[PDB]
């Protein structure tokens, strides 16, 4: 599991469950190519998006579909999405945890990168 | 104005208005002595807490009364208050802005220290 | 000034100065069209990006060029940029402040929407 | 494990290791009584602070000794401590994860509360 996404709801103090996550990788033509996607579990985590073989060096974008999450809770939020754009594996393979803490008019994102 | 406090509401996307703020200074007996207090304005800011003369080097605590703010909005919060403890240090002229971004189960606090 | 961008540096406790900011508007072909851009001032703020006339309802993206900011300071960052995607909605008069608090491996973004 | 503390370093994108954590509980005389303490592990987590029997209803303060952590990394930070003050178990026993994301001039704290 070289890439994991974790999403927390800062209004309820709970994992954000069933949040759609789309990962893209920048292609040589500079466009965003679909790479992997999934939904967060009951723990607010999304495991198994990729493998060490497929997760090569590159620029990746993790799009967390926060607006659909808040709309299902009856909240009209500010953001469409939370986006996390980063270069991965440029100094060799690493394990990445991308976390997002959500509120209707704010989000925080952090990364924990381990070798 | 050497010390200003700013509070933002991440649920409503607005300044957090009428939030009580208490500032304390650590005494020689290691207890916290009341130093200044007020309520945030319509802009979520609290100005005029102290003066350059009174705001000497020392350890200060800013307590932002977040629970009463959320309860007034009908929202169940986690924290009793947001706390910011810091040492004021003279290293040329300084102005301190202590900011807090609030959500019911999370807060971020930052300081902007300028000359 | 219906749209303002503010950027803060959580490592130095200062406004993030000379940060490039690019604003885009979603077009009918679903691509992102350049809309406005600038660099943050000495106060970490970027004013005058647009006018009430031009800033119509639509989906906007604010890209804050955080990686170039950290690299100029000699700090190894995680993100390529901080991204803020939102819909501008007319529901009475509105002023949008898009803020970003930056650290090398994390950022918080919030919006203050006032009348 | 009804109470766990997790600390992350937002400058390095790593767990914050060997961070001292002190927990206090408000006594009937309104003073803060020592309750539990420990140091974060290699994963930035602190487990085993208390038991379901000992972690009764009350107001608790989690003091994370951030200044000593940054000073060991050669950084003179703004805050003395990160403090998290909350009422626990007032609607019956709950499991609490108290997380803190650290930077030299800012900290964010969130809680994940599960039944």
In angstroms, the separation between the Cα of residue B57 and the nearest Cα of chain A is: 33
Structural contact between residues C21 and C63, judged by C-beta atoms closer than 8 angstroms: yes
- Tokens encoding C28: 């009918």
Give the count of beta carbons closer than 10 Å to the beta carbon of residue C87: 15
Asked if B13 and C101 come within 8 Å (Cβ–Cβ), the reply is no
- Tokens encoding D61: 């303060």
Pick among C11, C17, C45, C101 to test the B interface (most B CBs inside 10 A): C101
- Tokens encoding A45: 């985590």
Per CB-CB distance under 8 Å, the chain D contacts of C16 are none
The three-state (H, E, C) secondary structure of D31-68, written as one string: CEEEEEEEECCCCCEECCCCCCCCCCCEEEEEEECHHH
Q: Compute the radius of gyration of chain C from its Cα atoms.
A: 14
State how far the Cα of D64 lies from the Cα of D80, in Å rounded to an integer: 9
From the list B13, B105, B108, the residue facing A11 with the nearest CB is B105
SS3 D98: strand
Q: In terms of Cα–Cα distance, which of C4, B10, B69 is closest to A108?
A: B10
In angstroms, the separation between the Cα of residue C12 and the nearest Cα of chain D is: 6
Per CB-CB distance under 8 Å, the chain D contacts of A94 are none
Sign of CA dihedral C74, C103, C58, C48: negative
Give the count of beta carbons closer than 10 Å to the beta carbon of residue C111: 21
In angstroms, the separation between the Cα of residue B42 and the nearest Cα of chain D is: 24
- Those residues of chain B whose CB sits closer than 8 Å to some CB in chain D are 59, 78-81, 83-87, 105-113
Per CB-CB distance under 8 Å, the chain D contacts of C104 are 10-13
Cα separation values, C51 from B14, C2, C3, C20, C47, Å: 21, 6, 8, 20, 11
Q: In terms of Cα–Cα distance, which of B20, B43, B16, B42 is closest to B108?
A: B16
Q: In terms of Cα–Cα distance, which of A72, A61, A76 is closest to A22?
A: A61
Give the count of beta carbons closer than 10 Å to the beta carbon of residue A87: 16
Phi, psi of B68 (to 5 degrees): -65, -35
Q: Which residues pair with A63 in a beta bridge?
A: A22, A83
SS3 C101: strand
Q: In terms of Cα–Cα distance, which of B97, B98, C114, B14 is closest to A106?
A: B14
State how far the Cα of C106 lies from the Cα of D7, in Å rounded to an integer: 13
CATH 2.60.40.180 at A1-115, yes or no = yes
Please report, in range form, the residues annotated as the binding site of A for L-thyroxine.
6, 45, 108
State how far the Cα of A11 lies from the Cα of B22, in Å rounded to an integer: 25
Asked if B79 and D78 come within 8 Å (Cβ–Cβ), the reply is no
Q: Where are the domains of chain B?
A: 1-115
Cα separation values, A99 from D5, D95, D99, Å: 17, 20, 12
Q: In terms of Cα–Cα distance, which of A20, A8, A10, A28 is closest to A100?
A: A8
């Amino acid at each position: 599991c070289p890439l994991m996404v974790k999403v927390l709801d800062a209004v309820r103090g709970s994992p954000a469950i069933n949040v759609a996550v789309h990962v893209f990788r920048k292609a040589a033509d500079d466009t965003w190519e679909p790479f992997a996607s999934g939904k967060t579990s009951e723990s607010g985590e999304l495991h198994g998006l990729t493998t060490e073989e497929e997760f090569v060096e590159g620029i990746y974008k993790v799009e967390i579909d926060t607006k659909s999450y808040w709309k299902a809770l009856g909240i009209s939020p500010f953001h469409e999405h939370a986006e996390v754009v980063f270069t991965a594996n440029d100094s060799g393979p690493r394990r990445y945890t991308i976390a997002a803490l959500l509120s209707p008019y704010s989000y925080s994102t952090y990364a924990v990168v381990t070798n």
